[PDB]
Enzyme design. Structure first.
Site, PDB file in Angstrom:
ATOM      1  N   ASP A  54       0.840  -1.202   0.000  1.00 54.84           N
ATOM      2  CA  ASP A  54       0.000   0.000   0.000  1.00 54.84           C
ATOM      3  C   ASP A  54       0.888   1.270   0.000  1.00 54.84           C
ATOM      4  O   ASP A  54       1.715   1.385  -0.892  1.00 54.84           O
ATOM      5  CB  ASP A  54      -1.003  -0.089   1.170  1.00 54.84           C
TER       6      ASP A  54
ATOM      7  N   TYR B 210      -1.446  11.150   2.867  1.00 53.75           N
ATOM      8  CA  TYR B 210      -2.328  11.555   1.745  1.00 53.75           C
ATOM      9  C   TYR B 210      -2.407  13.084   1.559  1.00 53.75           C
ATOM     10  O   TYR B 210      -3.089  13.551   0.646  1.00 53.75           O
ATOM     11  CB  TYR B 210      -3.768  11.133   2.035  1.00 53.75           C
TER      12      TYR B 210
ATOM     13  N   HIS C 275      -7.309  -6.478  -0.409  1.00 56.16           N
ATOM     14  CA  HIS C 275      -6.314  -5.427  -0.203  1.00 56.16           C
ATOM     15  C   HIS C 275      -5.263  -5.773   0.857  1.00 56.16           C
ATOM     16  O   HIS C 275      -4.094  -5.449   0.680  1.00 56.16           O
ATOM     17  CB  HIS C 275      -7.005  -4.111   0.146  1.00 56.16           C
TER      18      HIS C 275
HETATM   19  O1  LIG Z   1      -5.362   4.544   0.073  1.00 58.05           O
HETATM   20  C1  LIG Z   1      -4.917   3.484  -0.332  1.00 58.05           C
HETATM   21  N1  LIG Z   1      -3.640   3.259  -0.789  1.00 58.05           N
HETATM   22  C2  LIG Z   1      -2.544   4.120  -0.438  1.00 58.05           C
HETATM   23  C3  LIG Z   1      -1.892   4.761  -1.631  1.00 58.05           C
HETATM   24  C4  LIG Z   1      -0.882   3.848  -2.295  1.00 58.05           C
HETATM   25  O2  LIG Z   1      -0.338   4.548  -3.410  1.00 58.05           O
HETATM   26  C5  LIG Z   1      -1.401   4.659  -4.294  1.00 58.05           C
HETATM   27  C6  LIG Z   1      -1.198   4.389  -5.634  1.00 58.05           C
HETATM   28  C7  LIG Z   1      -2.265   4.497  -6.506  1.00 58.05           C
HETATM   29  C8  LIG Z   1      -3.515   4.870  -6.044  1.00 58.05           C
HETATM   30  C9  LIG Z   1      -3.722   5.144  -4.707  1.00 58.05           C
HETATM   31  C10 LIG Z   1      -2.657   5.033  -3.835  1.00 58.05           C
HETATM   32  O3  LIG Z   1      -2.898   5.306  -2.496  1.00 58.05           O
HETATM   33  C11 LIG Z   1      -5.827   2.333  -0.438  1.00 58.05           C
HETATM   34  C12 LIG Z   1      -5.614   1.358  -1.393  1.00 58.05           C
HETATM   35  C13 LIG Z   1      -6.491   0.296  -1.477  1.00 58.05           C
HETATM   36  C14 LIG Z   1      -7.592   0.206  -0.643  1.00 58.05           C
HETATM   37  C15 LIG Z   1      -7.801   1.189   0.309  1.00 58.05           C
HETATM   38  C16 LIG Z   1      -6.915   2.253   0.408  1.00 58.05           C
HETATM   39  N2  LIG Z   1      -8.942   1.128   1.151  1.00 58.05           N
HETATM   40  C17 LIG Z   1      -9.474   2.424   1.542  1.00 58.05           C
HETATM   41  C18 LIG Z   1      -9.219   2.737   2.975  1.00 58.05           C
HETATM   42  C19 LIG Z   1      -8.144   2.170   3.634  1.00 58.05           C
HETATM   43  C20 LIG Z   1      -7.905   2.438   4.962  1.00 58.05           C
HETATM   44  C21 LIG Z   1      -8.750   3.292   5.631  1.00 58.05           C
HETATM   45  C22 LIG Z   1      -9.821   3.859   4.975  1.00 58.05           C
HETATM   46 CL1  LIG Z   1     -10.844   4.908   5.870  1.00 58.05          CL
HETATM   47  C23 LIG Z   1     -10.068   3.589   3.644  1.00 58.05           C
HETATM   48  C24 LIG Z   1      -9.568  -0.056   1.577  1.00 58.05           C
HETATM   49  O4  LIG Z   1     -10.399  -0.128   2.470  1.00 58.05           O
HETATM   50  C25 LIG Z   1      -9.176  -1.347   0.926  1.00 58.05           C
HETATM   51  S1  LIG Z   1      -8.724  -1.153  -0.813  1.00 58.05           S
END
Ligand SMILES: O=C(NC[C@H]1COc2ccccc2O1)c1ccc2c(c1)N(Cc1cccc(Cl)c1)C(=O)CS2
Ligand SMILES: O=C(NC[C@H]1COc2ccccc2O1)c1ccc2c(c1)N(Cc1cccc(Cl)c1)C(=O)CS2
Lengths: 546, 546
Positions: free
Chosen positions: B334, B465, B523
């Site tokens: 991630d 972020y 994920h």
């Molecule tokens: O944010 C994410 N990735 C980080 C970077 C990596 O580099 C990137 C490169 C390209 C695009 C985005 C990029 O973003 C991310 C990734 C997959 C998932 C996900 C979050 N979530 C949302 C979430 C997670 C935790 C808490 C909340 Cl509240 C909500 C899920 O629940 C499962 S799927």
């Protein structure tokens, strides 16, 4: 008045210079003069090399762009390149041959020691070659000696662009008149001078150092041999392992490679190995410098039984288990040296190699109590004073600054009477309340041991001497064994308790035993003779510990 | 009613049995039947072997005493030994060939999981051979799965002496009727039975396991494939490095060998790698599992700027510098996967190899803002909700047990609406206040993340972020580079944000890129499919990371 010193890398802090290789290759290949050098910097500020140095491209991306420039340069001189020719092969040898310029580093080290802000300003690349580790090891060694490292490929600026110089001044937080600038390239030297900085064109080191010594007014050339690099506690990686519900072990860790576990004596610290940790890590070892049970950040349970050799050795085995280490080389001094011989006797599968500083290996006499054995030699009389719980603690904990200043002294600095400690009634009887500072330590270093000993005092450390009957009985189980794994015995000429002579019969129990001896060295081996300790251990590790 | 299970090593937890080698060697050498076996146990309880097993002598001391017994045994059968014969050479192959009996360990693992106190009771030696590490690695792997390890050479007692059995009962703090005892030697099995313990003569594993499953009433044979070994936080080595005045990094460390630095995503922990840490350490790597800045025991400064990729990458370089590591392999998931590609782009000399789980490498669009780019794909809508400081923190920190139970779910367990997170106004709008426990985690594991997130909450993690413009501008400097160092991209079939399809053009920037794909994986790759993650990384490390 000067306050900062700036050094280039290639041709200044590292020799032979990589520039020089392009030219000596043309000579070796009877190629036209400056052919490879002209192909190198082809295109100027728009050329492949400038892009590499600004970080637009990596070294592996530049290699083919350079071969095309070598193609075109031979085409405009009406000659041809060889069959077994490779730019990759040339730069590989060039980067690998390039070693640190030790006197230049020594001069930089001395300037920082005298209050100078030091920095490296180099024109470099993003090295992605299969063999990039060599250069990574060079930079990692060097960088840690300077306040700043400014790399052209990281800043997107290059020498001799004036922007990089203004950038250097801003990062140094100094005016040009406060800056000395060392460079082996006149062109790159020019803007620093043009801005008002002091400059030195580095051709040969000696002359450059003469120029530097003159402008700073600090003796750098022909100066005494420096002490090995020490450790700043707050810059170390600190490790913590729970070996049982109430016992946690702390260690300082540095380097990669075979694990080397350092075990201090009484009344010491992981810090007692401060001059060995950077040296051994630099020699290709993963150093784990322990705070032994009862010391520093390690647990210090009150019970005497918690300090018998059997439990201390079992806990070190657990230390290895929890860290995922099948083996480590065990290097001990004083009480740590005793532990280390028992680690080799009871757990040979966990000991890659064993080395002791001062502490000999003397097997237990099954026909005599260790308390009777102690009697026999009046040198160990202080150990009887240590037997009664609370007595020695009260005296040693009363003034900590005094305790360590009185103890940590060279062979010619003796301030204490360890003979008839029983009779006089006390360890510090006719000792100064405010002793002089030994030539072996600084006030700052003594204050480190003071703060460390403030957590749990002397009970845990003194408890190491309170299990002689337990240790004797335990040691007697090993009376039929020999130490057959690699072993080193390091004797110290002027240790008046752990005299070299005590190690004389060791070969009867350790036949393949290797030796080391240090002339004019006291009990505190590591701080008394750091350079020679590192030399003896590094040489032994490379031959016996792989 | 049973409560404890005891297992022998040789022939029980490790196969082929070392006993068997003495016999198959006689067959291979057309020597008299039982010649080497009779020479082995020559003298009985007074013989060389008994002394070795009681720990009176080491393995290297026993080797020559055994050769003399082999001499005498051939002398009383009127035959002669070969030229290329060596007892040392025989035992070396015997110990090296001896591997762990995986189903027997699996059965021991299951018994401990169901409340059984487990222990190893073996007749063993103090191994001081040059090649003792192989056996040390075996014991170190095995021991960590049992409550106790009783070694004959450590206790000075041996099987079948009744004293060792009474010793075993005392250490187990159990009565004989509460003990199952497994041994491949009937003679050594006898006193346990004679004392009233349940016994199993181990010949073949399957039958022995049938016997064990029957007496315990627990399914052990044909049971489902077990999860890889996890980590008990309090049994780990915890490391701490100050990377700058206010920033300290924490990591968990296990194993020896090439350094492998594990980088978790959002909102995670070093613990997210719990199933990888023992597996990779066991595969010959030194695992450094990080708590990324803003997480767990690592510093979490409040400022957004402290979380831009440039500073996070610089601090990881400092992490390596302070630990004395010229390189490490960087493995990220991630947000850690994003860091890891930028570590490879900006610091290739410090990256031995790079691997990403789910996170693809997509270069920055210099012709479009990352905020416009996010707009274009409504899957990333939740990221706009994360922009405003304090908003997402308040919702995520409100109920931590709820936050992690809602998030850490398999692909078929979805409980949250990440689409139109902007409109509905909130991440948890139509989400249960008390969600069910996912099949991926235990209550204990969720509670670990809860306690970890109680220290500094979601500001630091959410700040990752909050630097898209900074990261975009920084990334644009690498737009002319390629990733040419070893690289692995691991896609997860059912990741609905980091979809496998997003990794499709990566080969344009990473030409020698290696791939891995995990079917029916969400994920949370590491906890969703631990076995396959470990298999893919171990295979890639052995081929690409040396
Ligand atoms: O944010 C994410 N990735 C980080 C970077 C990596 O580099 C990137 C490169 C390209 C695009 C985005 C990029 O973003 C991310 C990734 C997959 C998932 C996900 C979050 N979530 C949302 C979430 C997670 C935790 C808490 C909340 Cl509240 C909500 C899920 O629940 C499962 S799927
Ligand atoms: O005690 C010592 N060694 C530990 C074990 C190692 O195994 C052994 C093996 C054989 C004999 C003894 C063994 O003892 C020791 C050793 C040398 C010296 C020394 C102490 N002292 C006395 C001292 C130190 C600190 C505080 C106080 Cl109050 C007093 C010095 O000042 C410098 S010389």
């Amino acid at each position: 008045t000067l306050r900062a010193a700036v050094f280039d890398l290639d041709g200044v802090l590292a020799l032979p210079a990589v520039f020089g290789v392009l030219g000596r290759t043309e000579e070796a290949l009877a190629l036209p003069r400056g052919l490879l050098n002209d192909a190198f910097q082809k295109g100027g500020p728009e050329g492949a090399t400038t892009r590499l140095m600004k970080g637009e491209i990596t070294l592996s991306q530049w290699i083919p762009l350079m071969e095309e420039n070598c193609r075109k340069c031979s085409e405009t001189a009406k000659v041809c390149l060889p069959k077994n020719f490779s730019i990759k092969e040339i730069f590989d040898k060039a980067i690998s041959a390039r070693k640190i310029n030790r006197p230049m580093l020594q001069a930089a080290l001395m300037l920082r020691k005298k209050g100078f802000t030091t920095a490296i300003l180099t024109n470099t690349w993003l090295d992605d070659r299969a063999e990039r580790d060599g250069l990574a090891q060079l930079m990692c060694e060097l960088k840690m000696h300077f306040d700043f490292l400014i790399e052209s490929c990281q800043v997107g600026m290059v020498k001799p662009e004036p922007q990089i110089y203004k950038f250097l001044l801003d990062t140094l937080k100094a005016s040009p008149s406060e800056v000395v600038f060392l460079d082996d390239i006149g062109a790159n030297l020019k803007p620093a001078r043009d801005l008002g900085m002091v400059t030195i064109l580095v051709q040969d080191t000696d002359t450059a150092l003469k120029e530097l010594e003159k402008v700073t007014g600090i003796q750098l050339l022909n100066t005494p041999a420096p002490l090995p690099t020490s450790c700043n506690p707050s810059d170390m990686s600190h490790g913590y392992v729970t070996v049982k519900p109430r016992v946690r072990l702390h260690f300082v860790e540095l380097g990669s490679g075979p694990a080397v576990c350092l075990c201090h004596g009484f009344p010491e610290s992981w810090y007692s190995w401060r001059y060995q940790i950077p040296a051994l890590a630099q020699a290709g070892y993963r150093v784990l410098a322990m705070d032994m049970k009862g010391y520093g950040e390690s647990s210090a349970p009150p019970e005497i039984e918690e300090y018998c050799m059997e439990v201390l050795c079992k806990e070190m085995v657990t230390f290895l288990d929890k860290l995922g280490l099948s083996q480590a080389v065990f290097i001990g001094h004083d009480w740590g040296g005793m532990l280390v011989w028992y680690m080799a006797l009871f757990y040979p599968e966990r000991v890659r190699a064993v080395a002791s500083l001062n502490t000999p290996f003397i097997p237990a006499n099954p026909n005599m109590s260790p308390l009777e054995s102690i009697k026999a030699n009046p040198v160990f009389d202080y150990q009887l004073y240590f037997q009664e719980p609370g007595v020695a603690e009260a005296e040693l904990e009363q003034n900590l600054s005094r305790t360590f200043k009185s103890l940590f002294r060279a062979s010619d600095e003796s301030v204490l009477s360890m003979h008839k400690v029983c009779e006089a009634g006390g360890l510090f009887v006719n000792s100064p309340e405010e002793p002089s500072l030994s030539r072996m330590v600084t006030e700052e270093e003594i204050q480190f041991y003071v703060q460390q000993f403030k957590k749990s005092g002397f009970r845990g450390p003194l408890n190491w001497y309170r299990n002689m009957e337990r240790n004797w009985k335990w040691a007697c189980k090993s009376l039929g064994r020999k130490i057959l794994i690699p072993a080193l015995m390091v004797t110290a000429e002027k240790d008046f308790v752990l005299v070299p002579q005590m190690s004389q019969h060791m070969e009867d129990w350790i036949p393949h035993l290797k030796r080391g001896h240090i002339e004019d060295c006291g009990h505190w081996t590591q701080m008394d003779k750091p350079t020679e300790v590192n030399q003896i251990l590094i040489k032994w590790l490379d031959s016996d510990a792989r």
